[PDB]
Amino acid sequence: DMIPFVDLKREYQEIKEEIDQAIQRVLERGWFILGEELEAFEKEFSSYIGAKYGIGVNSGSDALYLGVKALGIGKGDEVITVSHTFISTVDAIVRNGAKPVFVDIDPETYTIDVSQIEKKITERTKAILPVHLYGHPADMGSIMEIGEKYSLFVIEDACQAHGAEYNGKKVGSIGDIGCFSFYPTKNLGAYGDGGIVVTNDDELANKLRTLRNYGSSKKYYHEFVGVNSRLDEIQAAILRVKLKYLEEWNEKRRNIARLYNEFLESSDLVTPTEKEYAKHVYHLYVIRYKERDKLQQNLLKCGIQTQIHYPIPMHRQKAYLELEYNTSLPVTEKICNEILSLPMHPWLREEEIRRISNCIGEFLWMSN
Amino acid sequence: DMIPFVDLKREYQEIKEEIDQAIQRVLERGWFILGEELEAFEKEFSSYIGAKYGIGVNSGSDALYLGVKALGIGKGDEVITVSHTFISTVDAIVRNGAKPVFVDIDPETYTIDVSQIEKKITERTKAILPVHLYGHPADMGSIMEIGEKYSLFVIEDACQAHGAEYNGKKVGSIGDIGCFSFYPTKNLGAYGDGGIVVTNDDELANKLRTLRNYGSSKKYYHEFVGVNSRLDEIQAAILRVKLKYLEEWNEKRRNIARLYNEFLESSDLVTPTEKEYAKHVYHLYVIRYKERDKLQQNLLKCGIQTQIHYPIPMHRQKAYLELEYNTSLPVTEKICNEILSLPMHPWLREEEIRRISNCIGEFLWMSN
Ligand SMILES: [Ca+2]
């Protein structure tokens, strides 16, 4: 009777026969690492995004970390990014020995405020790392203008944005590299950890294939210090099945967002925006409210689970307090106190959306 | 007609029903990350080794890397280890900012020469990292005496040695931590990447669980810069099945080694040794021969696949030539030119070992 924030059981039941067939093929072949399923998924996913090359890795975290590393970013370099993002966006910078320089967000889109990027550029800047947060693209026209003018790499964190578009172009295909997660709750999810880097640069693609394979480019050789970060054959096989459903499942998410907007736009809750330049894929459906703690408790009393993405922004996290530059991010700090994520996934039932709307309506009545 | 180096298809067919049931349980549960299969596998595997705690991670490479990190080893520190080992043993040290200090091997066991450790200790030394190479234990009594005398951590690289014993104690249970790989060809192999750290220290176990989970100990917090390095529920479930067979499969490997020794000990090939203190589990069956490349070519003509573990020792790799590694390790340098790994896995037939023997005998005739 509780409405959980996610329920991956529903997905498996919808595609059980195709998933079981894919897994069985890999077990029968006895080839689990760096095989034909991974090569085919890399080709299929890169073709879907409109990039020449795909390089499957163990996680979105590693896609970002290895992408920063392959671009030669490290000690003495700066990367401009947001504080309003998941951990791994900033760890990708710090683990390479570079330093983040934070920019505030646009309060409408929850993405990097492109009017505040240029004032952060120094002689040490090497890249801009925009985040397509919640499934909405960052304003990539302004970001690419700045990257061209200042000769900076553009690294897209598309981990929440599989299939999102900026002026009709798939996010992840615009910057030098695009990074995605296949964590199981992502819009395209594996049944374990996974991720990918996409690029049009063959030399960068080759460097990423060496780095992910213990820093070995040919059998017996160790050209530089690398990692073990590979997308398993079994997960690649699962992802080839699910990729064929991704456009359908994103349309389901967008239809749920349309229904929530019908019930909530008129309400005191600030509903998420889709800009004219955007195709939003609603990895998360995020509202803002002055009393979001009171609203979260009331939704739970109605049997509805919610989450916050994320209540402590990265510039306030213990991991970074000593190493980070001094920064002022008033919009990020205010937003993180006001946001709440409502249930959002392709398998939410009619009985769920109207029930969530009715709970919010009754709450706002009793509050006013 | 070919005798391949490993046969993962034959493994799967032996335990297919149990494996398929384990995978189906995980898919039906819809819980893929940090679940009950991982918790149960960690308890089962740590109990098997004789350690209090198990921390499943994505790879042996990460078990070593995170183990070094959790012990506080980093910039300004030295770790004494071997050059005759896999890449990831040494990358674990360098990725943390510490410097490896190499010592030579014993030509009989291919493991660290314990008589050469003490002279390399400095004020910077924090640990010794012995490797239980090919499934034979290092001389752990000597290593633990040096660790006690000089107050050094001992980190066991047990990635090739699941179930091996040193004076009746399982390797991995002796040092401060034990690190294992579940790469598919290991004696206990997953169907994708996996690994584990074992330890008796509850504080170290807790730090490892934080580091592997994006450096997050509790929801919404990032206390430390960490990684995403987790053993997937599906792989934990598979490994719980295979762990019940590990002792039986290691006994099959030991019986194959006994048969190779009968055919080859009196031959010009140097056969592997088991010291009185050792239970060798033969992850690899490694011989020495003066013209091992010509032997490898002739075995391939007979349809027999062989491998070399490893022809370029770590002190001669490009990754660590670029830092000043003019280290002089004459045993390592000689045996890397002479070693060859013969087929070794639990499914080889006695008459396949006779075919391999016949090919070697005909080659030795034609060479002499
Ligand atoms: Ca993995």
Side-chain angles (χ1 to χ4, degrees), chain B residues 33-34 49 74 121 129 157 191 208 225 234 238:
Chain B
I33 310 290
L34 294 173
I49 294 300
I121 296 175
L129 206 177
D157 186 343
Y191 299 145
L208 286 162
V225 179
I234 196 181
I238 283 158

Side-chain angles (χ1 to χ4, degrees), chain A residues 117-128:
Chain A
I117 293 170
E118 188 180 8
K119 68 184 177 182
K120 302 307 185 181
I121 298 172
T122 74
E123 284 295 326
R124 296 186 179 280
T125 316
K126 287 222 175 141
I128 311 167

Side-chain angles (χ1 to χ4, degrees), chain A residues 60-73:
Chain A
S61 296
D62 281 348
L64 292 156
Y65 169 66
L66 294 179
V68 169
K69 191 169 175 72
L71 287 167
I73 298 165

Side-chain angles (χ1 to χ4, degrees), chain A residues 71-338:
Chain A
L71 287 167
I73 298 165
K75 188 190 171 217
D77 299 332
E78 290 166 3
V79 176
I80 293 168
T81 194
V82 285
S83 170
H84 189 56
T85 190
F86 184 64
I87 290 174
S88 289
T89 308
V90 177
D91 280 3
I93 300 162
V94 174
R95 289 177 60 201
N96 277 295
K99 288 185 74 152
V101 177
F102 293 128
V103 177
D104 219 345
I105 52 164
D106 186 315
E108 179 176 45
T109 62
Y110 306 107
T111 68
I112 190 164
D113 179 349
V114 298
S115 76
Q116 295 200 62
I117 293 170
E118 188 180 8
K119 68 184 177 182
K120 302 307 185 181
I121 298 172
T122 74
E123 284 295 326
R124 296 186 179 280
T125 316
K126 287 222 175 141
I128 311 167
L129 206 177
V131 184
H132 302 308
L133 199 69
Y134 309 150
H136 191 283
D139 180 346
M140 291 299 288
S142 294
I143 293 163
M144 293 306 291
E145 165 71 25
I146 296 163
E148 289 152 7
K149 167 179 174 181
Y150 285 95
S151 301
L152 304 177
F153 299 120
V154 174
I155 297 164
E156 295 181 72
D157 183 345
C159 292
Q160 297 188 8
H162 308 68
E165 296 178 351
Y166 174 83
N167 284 341
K169 184 168 170 58
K170 294 283 193 293
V171 301
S173 73
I174 299 167
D176 295 274
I177 67 175
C179 302
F180 300 81
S181 172
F182 303 122
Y183 182 87
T185 59
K186 299 300 164 137
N187 282 29
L188 181 55
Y191 292 145
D193 281 297
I196 194 162
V197 184
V198 302
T199 188
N200 293 348
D201 179 338
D202 58 345
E203 292 181 318
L204 199 58
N206 189 59
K207 186 146 165 212
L208 289 161
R209 295 189 198 286
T210 298
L211 289 171
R212 77 176 177 183
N213 190 43
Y214 315 103
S216 174
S217 74
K218 277 94 73 204
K219 184 179 192 69
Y220 297 143
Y221 288 91
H222 184 35
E223 295 87 0
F224 36 70
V225 176
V227 303
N228 179 347
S229 190
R230 301 168 298 190
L231 181 64
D232 293 338
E233 281 293 284
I234 198 178
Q235 300 300 339
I238 284 164
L239 288 166
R240 293 178 69 198
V241 170
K242 290 197 203 184
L243 176 57
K244 295 175 291 194
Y245 294 89
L246 175 57
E247 282 289 315
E248 172 189 337
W249 291 346
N250 282 350
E251 277 309 299
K252 292 174 168 207
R253 293 172 176 273
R254 288 165 54 72
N255 190 58
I256 293 161
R258 183 181 63 78
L259 294 171
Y260 273 137
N261 286 344
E262 281 187 72
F263 293 117
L264 299 182
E265 280 178 345
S266 71
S267 86
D268 286 343
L269 279 56
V270 176
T271 53
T273 294
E274 182 182 64
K275 297 296 283 180
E276 105 281 355
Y277 57 75
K279 181 187 179 177
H280 198 327
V281 298
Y282 300 97
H283 173 58
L284 296 158
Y285 186 94
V286 178
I287 65 80
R288 281 168 62 199
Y289 184 61
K290 60 181 182 169
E291 288 182 335
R292 74 93 190 278
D293 296 335
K294 191 176 283 310
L295 174 64
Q296 177 174 60
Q297 167 67 31
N298 274 270
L299 280 162
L300 256 177
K301 283 196 250 103
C302 294
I304 302 150
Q305 190 181 23
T306 57
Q307 294 188 186
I308 304 165
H309 294 84
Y310 309 85
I312 305 169
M314 293 292 112
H315 73 285
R316 295 298 190 172
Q317 292 279 4
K318 180 64 168 46
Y320 303 129
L321 292 184
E322 300 291 78
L323 63 89
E324 69 183 320
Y325 289 131
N326 200 20
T327 189
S328 171
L329 301 165
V331 182
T332 295
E333 289 185 1
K334 174 172 69 146
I335 266 42
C336 288
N337 288 328
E338 295 180 353

Side-chain angles (χ1 to χ4, degrees), chain B residues 116-153:
Chain B
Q116 298 200 56
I117 294 170
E118 273 182 358
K119 71 181 164 188
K120 297 284 180 81
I121 296 175
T122 73
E123 67 284 357
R124 297 195 168 211
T125 314
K126 281 218 175 147
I128 311 164
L129 206 177
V131 183
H132 304 309
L133 199 69
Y134 309 149
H136 193 289
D139 173 4
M140 291 300 291
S142 298
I143 291 162
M144 296 307 293
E145 183 188 346
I146 295 166
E148 190 287 323
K149 177 176 173 192
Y150 294 91
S151 295
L152 303 178
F153 299 118

